[PDB]
């Protein structure tokens, strides 16, 4: 017997009762301002237990974030200060990292950290020889996403943190287009994991941070130091207030997504299998080595594709996603497929394609 009905599309209707219960709870007059404290207070570490369960971390070893960006930013620049004091400045990462991975460690390339920025080719996963073949006594870290958010390849990050774990470098991982959708991988001793909340349907203007500590080492979480300063939150990695709503919205996102997620692997490869079917007759190409690929990406080039047809197939991708999920497109930065060894030409005229079931 159901009784309800479907209101919200962009987010999932039990993800916007728990936000909307948590907003009306902080603004309206739910007990005095000391008995919500109390209850919120529960709440967030009721979050952060649940959330580092799902990548088998301890309570302590996850922060919340305003974004997978600070998320991103807290990790990196945060390693900085003990990469000077250990001489330990050579950092590896890829080329088709997202900007709030690439920008930070360009910033650092600027003070005097050794930044390789590895390029993927035509398959667009980094290989783990190319990644421990660049690996030195003396490198800090090694940045890699766990799944490209333009082309959906997955990157074979749980190969690279068994062996990195096992070496003083330490492993980042940007999983904001992974966390949920690739649950298993993200369960290995990955020591940063950054994590967005509006990749999985929570609202956005959240995210967290995962950080790992290592048993051998005394027992040390990862030796970040703080980029903003003022208050005790979030371990100090994070000072400030974040929103409990959106925190609240996040974990719940996260635990739809780990019950469901067989639900939602076969709804979206279902949608995949009939999208490419209509684009096969096309002369639009597929990017990224469809081995490794989420099943809710596409990233396809329009290189032969003249600007008619472009409009046509457009309005015929739509359409077949209609009644199933939400879509969205976006032109490619060329920057991520001239990573991928593109010509110029081709490398300007990409598309990404994104279906979340409803």
Known sequence: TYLDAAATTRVDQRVADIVLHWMTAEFGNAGSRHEYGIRAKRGVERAREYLASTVSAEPDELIFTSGATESNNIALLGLAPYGERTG?????????????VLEPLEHLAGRGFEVDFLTPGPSGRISVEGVMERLRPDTLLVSLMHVNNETGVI??????????????????????????????????????????????????????????????????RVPLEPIMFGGGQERKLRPGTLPV??????????????????????????????????????????????????????????????????????????????????????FTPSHVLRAMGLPEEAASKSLRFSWTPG
């Open 155 to 220: 990157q074979p990050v749980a190969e690279l943190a068994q062996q990195l774990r096992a070496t003083p470098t330490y492993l980042h991982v940007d999983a904001a287009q992974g966390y949920g959708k690739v649950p298993g991988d993200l369960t290995t001793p990955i020591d940063m994991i950054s994590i967005s909340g509006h990749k999985i349907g929570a609202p956005k203007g959240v995210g967290a941070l995962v950080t790992r500590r290592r048993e051998e080492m005394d027992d040390e």
């Open 245 to 330: 709503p959106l925190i609240m919205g996040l974990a719940e996102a996260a635990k739809i997504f780990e019950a469901e997620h067989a639900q939602w692997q076969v709804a979206a490869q279902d949608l995949r299998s009939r999208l490419l079917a209509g684009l096969a007759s096309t002369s639009f190409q597929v990017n990224g080595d469809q081995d490794h690929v989420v099943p809710h990406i596409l990233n396809l080039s329009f290189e032969d594709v003249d600007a008619e047809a472009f409009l046509v197939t457009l309005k015929d991708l739509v359409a077949v996603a209609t009644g199933s999920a939400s879509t969205s497109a976006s």
């Open 88 to 100: 330990r400045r050579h950092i590896i990462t890829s080329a088709i990292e997202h900007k709030a």
